[PDB]
């Protein structure tokens, strides 16, 4: 099942599409500058493209830990992101009462991988009718999302795509499961799948550019809806030669019959 | 680190308190009688005991399931439970506005496991100073607890208890790392530990709970925790292990 | 089921056995020392006692690290410890071809945990018709060890015990399943099971550490407890054999 | 580091060499059989071709499920296959006493996972000169590799294969870490590193062998280890088309910088 995002068509067997930008919003003009650079590499190497933030970061180490921008400035930005370039948005949220007034500005709405059994947050998500990104988490294994999807369906709404970023692997360290892509595609009627390298890599010795490269291409070998990254997190110059790579070997894949 | 709940002694060194009830409350009337038998059993075996509920469940098997009487009706009935009976209750609290109205009659407040490190929710349910139960995460490892424990005390609150509920151990499986309840004590500055038995084996029946209870509890722990006369046989097979591990002293140096 | 290892009953509802020794035999000296050390200890506890050692290290760190006393040398000292104690012993063999000799000398022949699979060394050992350790592997599942008892039985061997050495809990980590140990009885007979704690360990081996898993272990009613270790065995055993006696002395349910 | 069995270059910059065969030798016709369509379709695409099967299986389902024709006769099958079809050949040896014999045949000897740490068969092996496949225990991380090749360069061989066969996830499960190749590759002196997809999907079919086998190509590997009977047979071409694809689409880029 294909998802349409404006003029993107996301799916299993379509153009990957980048969901890359940033971790959380702290400037109106940084935001613009980094998502600038996105547009133009993305643009250049015809890679469809939806810019990601969060303008808040609820699980921080400390209380007085600096949390980003917040919802009311965040869709200020965010709607600028949208006039300048034309492109869509993605965002995740973390309360109910944030789902209507966040779906309406931002294209789509991510469902935090710690929330994924918030029951009241699925539901407030669905209600919206945007599409949400599903953040699979650690905990849960791949023949478990449909669980979550099955409670997006039953609440009305059926624009989800699911999104690895790891397994728990023992205490504090992550392993991806190139298999369970394959199990959510299959017991999850095909939605889109998405990869999140950057943070399935999180609990690794140098977040190594090598690293996340051999991950991204593997992930990408399985044929995927997208890709899910975080520069600063991989470095914004060495976006281009990345995206090089991935696009090489992403249309070797998807050119070829599946069976 | 002992915690004084009305007249309980809650500690690792202290009898085992039991916490148990009912997964949602549904009327006054329920309640009581479940609670009652909690009671009675809890009574006659002379074990320490807080009844345990919720009254708006957010992680609910499906959507429409029954998430409660709600705030307002659930605390009515939670008031009535401590004046029949005169024991400690316990709930849990996923938004932050619910936690001050939750806790003037909640002696714990419980940190679903879930969210546990949405900063919010931490310093709401610190800031009502009451005792609070620190639910593990079957993702985090026992010396990531610490992290909780600091956010709770930068904001005001060291009345915390940490709840072993079990770690992910390859798909769907949970194991309990029975070294885990030790590393929290000791990273933790010994507050006390309780073992969440129920949940730790929802992912394998009775002869599972007690081999699984006896073992967590030989390591020395404030608590037993369960979630939705066997309950007689299965405490008194508890009690006996427990008074036989709380008399002996801690090991030497 | 129980086995007889001469005047030892070893079994799930017996008193429990020590299995306990000395990693790698060096001299016949330091070897008896050793186990006088045990065995005084023990006799004083009144806990049944098996001498443990391996003859040879098979996963040396180095090719040029030393191998320990090899098969002739090793029996002689066997048979030196068997004569001044009376007590039973237990050894590891990882060749078909040492099953027989080492079976003459050993009361008790062990399978190491990464050979558990070679079934010409587990056919070997089937037919000297002695106790056998199985050793569970790392990797393998508590519901998985009923495929290699029934080899020994196919084999003509019923005289097994099942020895718990944790799982493979992500890279380089151990974890012991509490679980595991009653999985094993109720799929493999009732078939003695014990609980090797040294080798569960290895990853992490703390005192205070090793105790807590002893006791989380025996908790959940074994036949025995198995390892290589300023009293500090005799003030781990007291505890041991203080729990092991108020589990076994309640009925199973 | 590039190894080359006979006219072979195995390496992880090289284009990938496929290790296929079966699993026991039961009968020389049979053998020839398979042998001849691994010959076939891989000749047709120009992918180097070692065959594997073994002659004396240690580790079987039941004590008395058949081992192989045992190693004088498994030698003489080895020997028709490299005659009739010029090519290597690839068995495993699980005893001391089998490695001289074993290795005046065969172009590679292989030291089963559960074996990996048994320093005797380590020496033996390593004694022969052979090249040697080093199948990765499932209980082993991937930087411990390093030990088991220093007990080999201790004993004064250095012609080693890092072989991956997935590692323990909870109980009967097994997960392939895709960063574990890198982490060989840096730790083990860039050693060629193949993957047996096979075995690393034993506790799960022909659709999930084909994505774990790409995405383990995808990080850049020497080679990919697999059986047929395991692989339906005939569905070889299209499978190793699909492989041959990636692997040239990622040795003909550069490694990054
Ligand atoms: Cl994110
Ligand atoms: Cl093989
Ligand atoms: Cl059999
Ligand atoms: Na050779």
Request: hydrophobic content about 45%.
């Amino acid at each position: 099942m294909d998802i349409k995002i404006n003029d993107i068509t996301l799916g299993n067997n379509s153009p990957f599409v980048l969901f890359g930008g940033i971790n959380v919003l702290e400037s109106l003009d940084s935001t613009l500058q980094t998502c600038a650079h996105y547009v133009e590499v993305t643009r250049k190497l015809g890679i469809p493209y939806i810019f990601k933030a969060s303008f808040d970061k609820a699980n921080r180490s400390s209380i007085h830990s600096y949390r980003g921008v917040g919802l009311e400035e965040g869709l200020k930005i965010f709607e600028k992101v949208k006039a300048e370039f034309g492109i869509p948005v993605i965002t995740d949220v973390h309360e109910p009462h944030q789902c209507q007034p966040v779906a309406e500005v931002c294209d789509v709405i991510q469902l935090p991988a710690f929330l994924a059994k918030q029951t009241d947050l699925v539901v407030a998500m669905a209600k919206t009718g945007n599409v949400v990104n599903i953040k699979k988490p650690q905990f849960l294994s791949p023949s478990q999302m449909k669980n979550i999807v099955e409670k997006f369906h039953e609440a009305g709404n059926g624009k989800l795509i699911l999104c690895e970023r790891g397994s728990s692997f023992g205490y504090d360290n992550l392993v991806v499961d190139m298999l369970g892509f394959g199990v959510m595609k299959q017991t999850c009627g095909n939605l889109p799948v998405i990869f999140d390298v950057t943070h399935s890599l999180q609990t690794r010795d140098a977040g190594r550019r090598a690293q996340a490269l051999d991950l991204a291409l593997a992930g990408m070998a399985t044929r995927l809806a997208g890709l899910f990254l975080e520069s600063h997190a991989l470095p914004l110059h060495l976006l281009e030669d990345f995206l090089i790579r991935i696009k090489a070997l992403d249309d070797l894949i998807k050119s070829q019959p599946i069976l």
